Amino acid sequence: MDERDALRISREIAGEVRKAIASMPLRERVKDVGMGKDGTPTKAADRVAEDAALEILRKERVTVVTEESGVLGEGDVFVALDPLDGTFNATRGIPVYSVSLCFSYSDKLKDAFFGYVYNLATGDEYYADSSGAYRNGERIEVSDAEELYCNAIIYYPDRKFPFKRMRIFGSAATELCFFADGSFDCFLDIRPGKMLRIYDAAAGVFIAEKAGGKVTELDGESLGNKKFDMQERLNIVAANEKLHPKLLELIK
Amino acid sequence: MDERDALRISREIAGEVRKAIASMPLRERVKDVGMGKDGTPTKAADRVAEDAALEILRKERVTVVTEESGVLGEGDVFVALDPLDGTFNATRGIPVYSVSLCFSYSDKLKDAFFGYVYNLATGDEYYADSSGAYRNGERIEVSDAEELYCNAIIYYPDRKFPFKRMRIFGSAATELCFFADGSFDCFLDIRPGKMLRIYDAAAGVFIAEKAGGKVTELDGESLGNKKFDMQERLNIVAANEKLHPKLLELIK
């Protein structure tokens, strides 16, 4: 499997997940249908999204790591799949939610070869491969902001902060792309519980890095050894190379 | 002028603003075009929006209070107009932004008779009159949540908080509607600088109250004597009757 195959698979999935969710009324979407393997409830929207995705991934030699059904398959290529990221928004008709796919040649983030976040409400498509990062077919990159007085997405502000703006949209996979294309200047998830899971962030990270972002754990350690499993957890500090160290110091 | 005229006018305005913005590329939207009367830059998107609105409102015996052009007209009915709320998102292409109109029989909020917030990205329409509050022609009401462990929209969290979720979308007018239809359990703007302006909040406030929400100033003070002018600033605590007092004590 290569970055071209991945793009093809990722798009086929996006189309199906899009249809499935778009035809589903909010009263249907919001219903609890079971306990996800992640240890949180699967909403009817989650299950519908995941089924459409797994139907397609089933035909590839991959091991799938996915929120609701957990680890599936035996393949050598690993896929961190968030079938629906921002479910809470989706169940309320707030148009920030996505399907996220990160493809890796091992069970570690360092071997990623393809990242893909499709906005299910806007049809916006973000991906990155060896040729860089894209928003709807156009090369994107991160902002060149060097000042803490910038536009930040942050989970969660718990003290006074120097930022010009703070936003929290509820879809890390999508918001990481907002940072990737420069819409925002940095992305922080510094929650002490360490809540983010591999499928939430993997693609977002990969795309942000290809867009020139420096993306690291709370203390600046590499995300390379983050595992494609259900136990993995993440904090994230992501910004351009110059703003990044300033953020690291800001949160000590 | 009554509540029906208001709805008719608001819908006419919404159609024009929505068509104007949808045809406008992001690279055009984001351009600074002048300094607004509020003391912040007018973006090209702001101007296109405001001109569309004013072309329709100028045919009415109203005094208009609007972000970019300021106080206009001589009429006895006052209209707080945010021609584009969430401009930052709109320039981004992030689908949370609205046109907001609140109509009053004086220059104070207490004499409001109509509230209208239209999401320009989704086509969602929120309004309220003497018959209650609506999202897309359906009656809405606020959630009955009694616990601080709830879903909050809050500008800005500056300490540790007991909330289940925190969201900040960048359009107070729209987020006030999210609270109004119960998508969220409360809306808080507790920014010490007192940043909200009359046209950001008036319509949303009116709609929330009609949906059953209790909406006050930082100290439980009434919003009734808030002025339809450029000098007015607001903080907001908005939740149902039960949850509201708890939030009040939480933020002392």
Ligand SMILES: N[C@@H](CC(=O)O)C(=O)O
């Ligand atoms: N995923 C898109 C295709 C694309 O992104 O170009 C679809 O709806 O089929």
Ligand SMILES: N[C@@H](CC(=O)O)C(=O)O
């Ligand atoms: N947005 C909620 C839950 C969800 O989106 O499914 C959260 O993880 O905080």
Ligand SMILES: N[C@@H](CC(=O)O)C(=O)O
């Ligand atoms: N998924 C959310 C839904 C809500 O808070 O309304 C929960 O844990 O309850």
Ligand SMILES: N[C@@H](CC(=O)O)C(=O)O
């Ligand atoms: N999730 C919403 C987005 C919107 O309100 O446009 C829906 O398509 O139902």
Ligand SMILES: N[C@@H](CC(=O)O)C(=O)O
């Ligand atoms: N209007 C905003 C835009 C931005 O922050 O990039 C400003 O203060 O510059």
Ligand SMILES: N[C@@H](CC(=O)O)C(=O)O
């Ligand atoms: N707020 C969400 C964001 C996401 O699901 O990506 C979370 O805590 O996981």
Ligand SMILES: N[C@@H](CC(=O)O)C(=O)O
């Ligand atoms: N403003 C809407 C009218 C409506 O809300 O029914 C439109 O553009 O058609």
Ligand SMILES: N[C@@H](CC(=O)O)C(=O)O
């Ligand atoms: N006024 C918004 C951004 C904008 O719409 O210009 C903020 O400062 O958060």
Ligand SMILES: N[C@@H](CC(=O)O)C(=O)O
């Ligand atoms: N603001 C965006 C909305 C969206 O992406 O759906 C646009 O009109 O391009």
Ligand SMILES: N[C@@H](CC(=O)O)C(=O)O
């Ligand atoms: N989020 C707010 C920012 C402000 O008014 O200061 C708004 O644009 O409605």
Ligand SMILES: [Mg+2]
């Ligand atoms: Mg779950």
Ligand SMILES: [Mg+2]
């Ligand atoms: Mg302005």
